[PDB]
Amino acid sequence: SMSVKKPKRDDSKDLALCSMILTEMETHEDAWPFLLPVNLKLVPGYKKVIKKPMDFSTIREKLSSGQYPNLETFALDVRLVFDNCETFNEDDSDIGRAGHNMRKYFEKKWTDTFK
Ligand SMILES: CC(=O)Nc1ccc(O)cc1
Numbered sequence: 190s191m192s193v194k195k196p197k198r199d200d201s202k203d204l205a206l207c208s209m210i211l212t213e214m215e216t217h218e219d220a221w222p223f224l225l226p227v228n229l230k231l232v233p234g235y236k237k238v239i240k241k242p243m244d245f246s247t248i249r250e251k252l253s254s255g256q257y258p259n260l261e262t263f264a265l266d267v268r269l270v271f272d273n274c275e276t277f278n279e280d281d282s283d284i285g286r287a288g289h290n291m292r293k294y295f296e297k298k299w300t301d302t303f304k
Pocket residue numbers: 222223227232273274277278284
């Protein structure tokens with residue numbers, strides 16, 4: 190409360206560490222469905238069904254231009270990529286499997302790096 194503060198966690202390296210994690214995501218061999226925005230003109234159903242599209246290149250642009258206020262808003266966008274993927278793709282599809290794999294990959298890096 191007013192003039193009563195918790196000890197200050199060091200957040201000065203958060204931007205650099207998130208960028209490192211995103212680089213490792215971008216270079217994973219199963220990243221290919223997620224590198225660029227889904228083409229809303231060419232993929233039936235995607236625009237109407239998926240209310241907030243998100244992809245690695247969009248996250249990279251937001252990270253490089255100061256659009257994440259903290260490391261949690263960054264994690265929310267990464268998770269959104271995989272939540273969208275589950276919504277639109279069967280678990281037993283190449284893209285469905287890729288999404289499950291990448292989510293597992295991310296959450297381990299997240300825990301090891303910040304928790
Ligand atoms: C990330 C993603 O769901 N991409 C995607 C899914 C189905 C399709 O027909 C084309 C692209």
